[model samples]
Target chain A: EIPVPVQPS
Target chain B: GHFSVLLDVKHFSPEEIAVKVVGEHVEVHARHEERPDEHGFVAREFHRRYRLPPGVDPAAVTSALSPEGVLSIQAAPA
Candidate 1:
């Protein structure tokens, strides 16, 4: 259930 | 009261989010807590989106709002 990071570092 | 608008964020906490305008684009980013210190702890989630603003868009008039359900709404007038 891993999703894309909305705020990518 | 006169803040410009054009961002809509939902389902997030203000303490874990940031909004900024870079050049001719508006960037909205949200980072939830990550890494559970314990079994009962939780990890942080993150989200991000950007919009290219058109000409005549006044940066000074840009504003954003976060709803109770985590709806961050941003709006700006022409």
Candidate 2:
């Protein structure tokens, strides 16, 4: 599964 | 506690899959991991069925909680 970087709020 | 409980934390850690979690902001939320804005939004939606407010994370602070169940017992309740 591809991983995504959680947006830095 | 149930206030401004809204926003978007998508691209969030979904599926409950076990993955390494990097603590967000890390201010400490009681005994729980520092509440994640994105995660909180999802939880709020499930509980309240919608966003409670506009901004969910404005002034991040340490949240304190008490066990009401323990307090309910008639054992020298505080």
Candidate 3:
């Protein structure tokens, strides 16, 4: 449902 | 947002509903069922709750079902 510009911490 | 509908959001409940409501609350669609108070739906009211995203996950599930059942019951009483 979401896209992170970077890998999620 | 491929919902081959993994993890089962319930009635397409909130499956793709982001697992991390703490950080993903901004997306809204992804926050489905993030809080127990509003399971099966984005917990808009939860933003008003004390713990916010800290409430017990188990509690949320029961409460959501209660809410879901109640919601449906108003029309058909599941």
Model 3's C-alpha root-mean-square deviation from the true structure amounts to 16.1
**Which regions of candidate 2 fall more than 4 Å away from where they truly are?**
A1-9, B1-52, B56-62, B69-78
- Candidate 3: the clashing residue pairs are B9-B13, B9-B14, B9-B15, B10-B13, B18-B30, B36-B60, B73-B77
Scored against the true structure, residue B77 in model 3 reaches a CA lDDT of 15
Candidate of highest lDDT: 1
lDDT of the candidates, in the order given = 0.45, 0.22, 0.23
Name the runs in model 1 displaced over 4 angstroms. Answer: A1-9, B1-11, B35-39, B56-58, B61-63
Greater TM-score among 1 and 3 belongs to 1
Residue B6 miss distance in model 2 (angstroms) = 16
How would you encode candidate 1's per-residue C-alpha lDDT over B9-77 as one tens digit per residue?
444565566666556555556666654555676655554545545643434433334353343333434
DockQ of 1: 0.04
What tens digits encode model 2's per-residue C-alpha lDDT throughout B3-53?
Answer: 312222233233321111122221111112334674463232221122222
lDDT of 1: 0.45
Output the TM-score of candidate 2: 0.17
Query: Residue B53 of model 3: what lDDT?
Result: 33
Model 1 fnat? Answer: 0.00
- The numbered model that scores best in DockQ is 3
